[PDB]
């Protein structure tokens, strides 16, 4: 607030939630570009269920007009 008040929002302390952003990546959201588990196309976890339900899943997680694992910031 004080930084906002003095007209210097660039001085804010904004910590990015790296840990949740990691989890979302492991779940297959590709925004953050960590490439883990269900993000990475060369992972056993991906190759196992890719012809099961993941196409319906991954399609839904990455539609950001829906509520499923919303985008996260400071």
Partner 1 sequence: DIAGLTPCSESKAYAKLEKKELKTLEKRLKQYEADSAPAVALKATMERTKARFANYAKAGLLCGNDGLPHLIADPYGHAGEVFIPTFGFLYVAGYIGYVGRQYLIAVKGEAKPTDKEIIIDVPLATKLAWQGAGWPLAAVQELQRGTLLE
Partner 2 sequence: MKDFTTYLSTAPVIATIWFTFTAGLLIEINRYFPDPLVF
**Where do contacts with partner 2 occur on this chain (CB under 8 A)?**
8, 11, 13
- Residue 5 CB, shortest distance to partner 2, in Å, is 15
- Residue 17 CB, shortest distance to partner 1, in Å, is 8
Q: Residues 12 to 41: which contact partner 1 by CB under 8 A?
A: 12-16, 18-19, 21, 31-34
- Residue 13 CB, shortest distance to partner 2, in Å, is 7
How far does the chain reach from its first CA to its final CA, in angstroms?
14
Q: Which two tokens stand for residue 55?
A: 């196409």
Partner touching 5 among partner 2, partner 1, none, CB below 5 to 8 Å by kind: none
* Dihedral sign from CA coordinates of 26, 32, 33, 39: positive
Of 22, 17, 19, 51, give the one whose Cα is nearest residue 35: 22
Is the Cβ–Cβ distance between 44 and 37 less than 8 Å? no
Partner touching 39 among partner 2, partner 1, none, CB below 5 to 8 Å by kind: none
């Amino acid at each position: 607030d004080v930084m906002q008040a003095f007209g210097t929002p660039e001085k804010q302390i904004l910590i990015e939630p790296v840990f949740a952003q990691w989890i979302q990546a492991a779940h297959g959201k590709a925004l953050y570009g960590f490439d883990f588990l269900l993000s990475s196309k060369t992972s056993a976890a991906f190759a196992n269920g890719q012809s099961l339900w993941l196409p319906g899943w991954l399609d839904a997680i990455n539609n950001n007009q829906n509520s499923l694992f919303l985008t996260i910031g400071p």
